[PDB]
Symmetry: C3
Subunit: 250 residues, 3 copies
Amino acid sequence: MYETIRYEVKGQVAWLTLNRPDQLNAFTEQMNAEVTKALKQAGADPNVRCVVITGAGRAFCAGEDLDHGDVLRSRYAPMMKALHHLEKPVVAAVNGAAAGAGMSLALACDFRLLSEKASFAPAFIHVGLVPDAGHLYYLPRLVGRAKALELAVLGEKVTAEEAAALGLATKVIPLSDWEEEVKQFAERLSAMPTKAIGLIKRLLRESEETTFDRYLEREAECQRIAGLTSDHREGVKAFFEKRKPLFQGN
Amino acid sequence: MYETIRYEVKGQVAWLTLNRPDQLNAFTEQMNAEVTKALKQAGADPNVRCVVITGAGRAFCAGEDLDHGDVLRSRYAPMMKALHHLEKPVVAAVNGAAAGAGMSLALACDFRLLSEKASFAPAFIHVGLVPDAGHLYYLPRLVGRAKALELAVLGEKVTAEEAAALGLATKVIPLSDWEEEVKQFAERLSAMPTKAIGLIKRLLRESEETTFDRYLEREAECQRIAGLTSDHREGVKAFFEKRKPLFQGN
Amino acid sequence: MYETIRYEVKGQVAWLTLNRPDQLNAFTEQMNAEVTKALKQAGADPNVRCVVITGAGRAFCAGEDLDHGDVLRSRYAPMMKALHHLEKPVVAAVNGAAAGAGMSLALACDFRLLSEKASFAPAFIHVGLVPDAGHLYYLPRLVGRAKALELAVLGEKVTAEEAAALGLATKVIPLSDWEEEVKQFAERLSAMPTKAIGLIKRLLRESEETTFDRYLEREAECQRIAGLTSDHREGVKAFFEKRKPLFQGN
């Protein structure tokens, strides 16, 4: 099987659990490699309509287990590129501490559900390093330049509620409610028109990399595709029937 | 005349009213075409110093009246390009429901005045489609990536006050106050240095598409232009006279 | 010496004080030139680990002392490029009114500490001009498109607490506390791993100008550099010693 993570499809959600609980799920070469493979697996599997990444144990992910360039390009780049190109929704279920590259991973996901005991630690600066695995590409796109610099430079840990105030949490979930609310959010996404969700992620990528004029040409192509989909014709037949749509993801 | 919209200059404001009230001002081929023409008209008219877009009836615009690519490139692209290149200020006076491409249109305007009964519905996903007519180009530039994805993916309707909290409303206006506050806001803009306002819109476009170094060269050119303007010399003569400036828009 | 500014290194912080108090520290050709030189000086000095820019007297900077293009390209462009390429942290200690290009200068800094009596005045529009010296490049990257347009177009002055609400202040400092809190914030930064801070500023620049794929290659190169640094090996030796790290900035 996988050795540093757990990959389990339950219903139509792939549960990707980071699994080195004694080391707070800190990344190693094979965790990096397994996460990459699992993300590509989830992307290729027609039965997978949502992905959840969460940590085993008390923490979400403490980042690198403690040439830095080579570490990044050989281990982290393939993983972050797989995540970045994955066209299924991905929820970071941040069950506890996310620090370093663990914070990076959470920022790269589409939704972040923070348990009431979770926290984000942009800890790189305290060992004289820079935020990495994509951190400074994502962070200002979520919080603007000033807050991203403050986080990266001052390195101060943020609580779940402080993360929510910053715009870094989709929601904060009480501990007793954790397992059920996470599952319901993931199942709720896994029931939506998955192909339209992938195309909107594609378009959000286009939005950050292209000009307005070219963007509209990309958009029109995405909509020709969504429009041909079975889910679209279910959505229209259910609207024009005062009925609840049943979507399949194609 | 125009048949699906009303275009009326009152004072120095062009009132562009979307006018298919029985279908909640939903777009058709000729509404798309008329809005395009009217925006270009307003842009070319030296007497027009502000534009207001609003909906007749209860709603602002319910979006497409219900090949998707061809629909977008042939109808919506010319309209959104006309809006995007228009260098006069444009206020979306969102009098009621804005859904689908109606929400898109509102996001593309410079200011959004929401009546207390208005709402934004990113409804595309519920029929298995993607937000379009520029939606995902504008939205993350207003609310950041995470909130834009949440809106696009979960598709949940937002109230006027929730839109204001998200940074999607310039202000929320009580119903009894609606007609007067909208007119005063538009007249207030129509009295400002319209040529400087067009150049700042030009520069905001440059800001999103160019690098810092090139940006400064674009800025210097815009300021040479604003500096030659009659409005600039009125502004300086009124400052150095403890007086209220009277601007003409050139 | 310098004539329109004061440049003084105290400890490891360069205090760059704008110094035309009778004209509210408004820029002239030689203030522009001196600030440029001083920023490059601070950047080249291994003993300087933080920069503070503040105004002498009651105001921070009222902007241009009252061909606009030539003014910008010959005076302001070199100054803003020096600031933009400076890889040491720069705090704008906004002691009072920042208006016009004075507001521009504050937005270009990494942190903005506002005294309780400071204010930001995007005043350009009231003389028929556009916000300049980089204003519209920085501003939407801090507050999003809508608020940047509202500020630029309506030109309404904002209080310290309103700036904090907008995301334009790192913090608001009471008047009695001003001198000490500013010094402690600057000294606190001057003690951090300055080379990692410069590399994160480099990466924030890369983040706004490059694509995701290229960004990761830039990041890996920055981290190879931070990783070789003496500060990094101090940070690791102090973590693995339950000890407070002592950083030198190399």
